């Protein structure tokens, strides 16, 4: 995976370089000499993460621009997968935001402590003397704690009164909440909570844009540095402003920079959400609604110029059920068909609302956003394949099989695919009976066309014909390797991770290294 390695190494370099660079820009130069004695080394430790966060804060919103990335795919296979790790990149970039935010916050806790301590004559003489600046006219403070409130109440006062402190507290709460509600448990069991509380990025970014507006972290100005030679003027602080050589130094603060970094990504994400709104408005007529047993309804629907590839999924917004939310459902229909369909299991409040609106128990207004997902158009490339689906993961394989029949009837000569072995791993066929009917149908079409050998499928019950218990992968791989010698076998699976590791192990173990042997090529959804 050289491309994603390289992105992470450029990204991590451009964080390490920024850390070291904005560390040394606030540590070495004599512009920050006086501020580095009031704040010590904890100044640069606070400002290097600031620039690192500036860079990471653009890099978070970009990969989650799903409509812009849809347009970029439209403008456009391993590299396609690598650029489909946008969510993984988002995750790690947000995690390193958390790291650098922790460093920034800790260093600023040190800064606030040492800026209240010096203000109340509880530090070394020089820092206390430096905190005295800014009290009177014609002098700019260096210590941003101005009221003589003793610690630890003084630090709290600065937090609840300084704009930087208030915004930092707010956006740190809004970041911790995002992180804690973006654990796999919430992102996979209560995705409603994840998506709602993950919309604190707006508050995070609004607070972050105005975070550095006060310019409290101040360094000595260029003109002051020109008139105020520090190596001469450091030890004569008690008489500053009272000799020719040493005027009172003037400290200004660096103008806010974060907005310059983040407006591009925020503009791009708002554009993304406007494309999503437009996809919402784009009309989608629901041609037919079959309700397969055990509370699953399939929506045959037609939208203006909708193109899709096998294995892709669409988000379905129903304004009547829910105005804000988008619910993804795997496309279960072949690209050739005029209508694109999805099967929805009625397991929750939004699907139940769609069920009631459809009238299965007039039709609801639904909106379709994007044929997103990783295209599985390479299934047809190989001469033999092993389609494996467990539980709910079998759904995209339905669309794959439907498209296989269309490629067999339309061309029958350009179909590189020759053989299907399908394995379905469900506790019971209690929610996917339509898929069972699908497999019976495809077997029937193969038998009627005098090509019954095309599709072989077995159903296994964890709790051809259905079987009990998990399949013996060792024996199955050996059997089909004996069946097909010196040909590539593409193994496709959508299911548990342990199952994926199992299939990887058997694929490597049963594959022959030489080109004159059988190669088992595993692909995982």
């Amino acid at each position, epitope marked *: 995976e050289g491309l994603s390695i390289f992105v992470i190494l450029v990204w991590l370099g451009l964080n390490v370089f920024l850390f070291v660079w904005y560390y040394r820009v606030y540590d070495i130069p004599p512009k920050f000499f006086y501020t580095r004695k009031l704040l010590g080394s904890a100044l640069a430790l606070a400002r290097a993460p600031a620039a690192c966060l500036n860079f990471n804060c653009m890099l978070i919103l970009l990969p989650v621009c799903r409509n812009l990335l849809s347009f970029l795919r439209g403008s456009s296979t391993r590299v396609r997968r690598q650029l489909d790790r946008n969510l993984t990149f988002h995750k790690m970039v947000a995690w390193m935001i958390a790291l650098h935010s922790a460093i920034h916050t800790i260093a600023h806790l040190f800064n606030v402590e040492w800026c209240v301590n010096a203000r109340v004559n509880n530090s070394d003489p020089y820092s206390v003397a430096l905190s*005295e600046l800014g*009290d*009177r*006219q014609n002098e700019s403070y260096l210590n941003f704690a101005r009221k*003589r409130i003793k610690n630890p109440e003084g630090g709290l006062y600065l937090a609840v009164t300084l704009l930087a402190g208030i915004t930092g507290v707010v956006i740190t709460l809004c970041l911790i909440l995002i992180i804690t509600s973006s654990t796999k448990t919430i992102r996979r069991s209560y995705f409603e909570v994840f998506w709602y509380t993950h919309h604190l990025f707006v508050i995070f970014f609004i607070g972050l844009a105005i975070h550095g507006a006060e310019r409290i972290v101040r360094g000595q100005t260029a003109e002051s540095l020109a008139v105020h030679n520090i190596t001469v003027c450091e030890q004569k*602080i*008690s*008489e*500053w*402003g*009272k*000799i*020719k050589e040493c005027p*009172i130094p003037q400290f200004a603060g660096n103008p806010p920079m974060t907005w310059k970094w983040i407006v591009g990504p925020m503009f791009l994400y708002l554009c993304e959400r406007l494309v999503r709104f437009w996809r919402s408005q784009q009309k989608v007529v629901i041609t037919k609604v079959v309700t397969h047993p055990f509370k699953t309804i399939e929506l045959q629907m037609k939208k203006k110029g909708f193109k899709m590839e096998v294995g892709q999924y669409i988000f379905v917004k129903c304004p009547k059920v829910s105005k804000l939310e988008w619910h993804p459902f795997t496309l279960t229909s072949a690209p050739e068909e005029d209508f694109f369909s999805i099967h929805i299991r009625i397991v929750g409040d939004w699907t139940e609302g769609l069920f009631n609106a459809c009238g299965c128990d007039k039709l609801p207004k639904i909106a379709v956003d994007g044929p997103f997902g990783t295209a599985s158009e390479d299934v047809f490339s190989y001469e033999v394949v092993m389609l494996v689906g467990a539980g709910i993961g079998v759904t995209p394989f339905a669309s794959i099989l439907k498209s296989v029949w269309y490629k067999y009837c339309n061309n029958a000569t350009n179909l590189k695919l020759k053989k299907i072995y399908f394995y379905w791993l469900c506790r019971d066929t209690h929610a996917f009976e339509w898929f069972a009917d699908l497999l019976q149908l495809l077997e029937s079409q193969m038998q009627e066309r005098n090509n019954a050998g095309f599709l072989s499928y077995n159903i296994y019950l964890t709790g051809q014909k259905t079987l009990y218990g998990r399949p013996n992968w060792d024996n199955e791989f050996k059997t089909i390797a004996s069946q097909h010698p010196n040909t590539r076998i593409g193994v496709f699976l959508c299911g548990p991770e342990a199952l994926a590791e199992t299939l990887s192990k058997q694929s490597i173990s049963n594959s022959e290294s030489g080109p004159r042997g059988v190669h088992f090529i595993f692909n995982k959804e």
Partner: antibody
Amino acid sequence: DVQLQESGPGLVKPSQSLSLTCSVTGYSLTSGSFWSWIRQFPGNKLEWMGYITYDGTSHFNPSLKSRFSITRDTSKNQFFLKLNSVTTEDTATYYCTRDPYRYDAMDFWGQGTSVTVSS
Amino acid sequence: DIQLTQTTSSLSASLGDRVTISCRASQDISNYLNWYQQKPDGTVKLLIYYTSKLHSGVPSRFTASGSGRDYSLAISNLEQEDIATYFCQQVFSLPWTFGGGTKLEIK
């Protein structure tokens, strides 16, 4: 060390102009300090009159309208008080002082000159 | 102009007795108050600046302390050279207003 003498007319007439000289010996005005002219009225009531900085900048008490001004003779190492249109209330003991601290404290004061205004 | 008021216009005490001279500023001054001692012959000399910093050269018995508006000068043990008027001056905002003064009379 540094010592300040005030020298000037001890009895000016009302509506005249008062001109007081402060001679500094152990320090030069251009080397650096704020050189004030605090005066004490009868009844022991001090008020900051106005200072001239080392750079030559001079700042006045606004209670003194525009009737008060400070100049200096750096060659002779001395600075001067100049009150236009002196009134009867201008009678006071004028102390010329040196202010070398960033805390604006007058460490060295003069002995003072008692200026009287009467007809 | 900020008005510095010394409530004690005149105070009496004995030798070797603690005396406190307190003055209050009409507006908050950021510890920017200085203390001067004017001898009866009119010689003024700085005692403390910034409300705590003892001017190099005056006896250690002069200790001053205060915050915000209220400031005080304390002398531990009195002798005959402490007969003098004591002024508190701000330097926080121009004009640098002085205090009323406080004469010390030994009993």
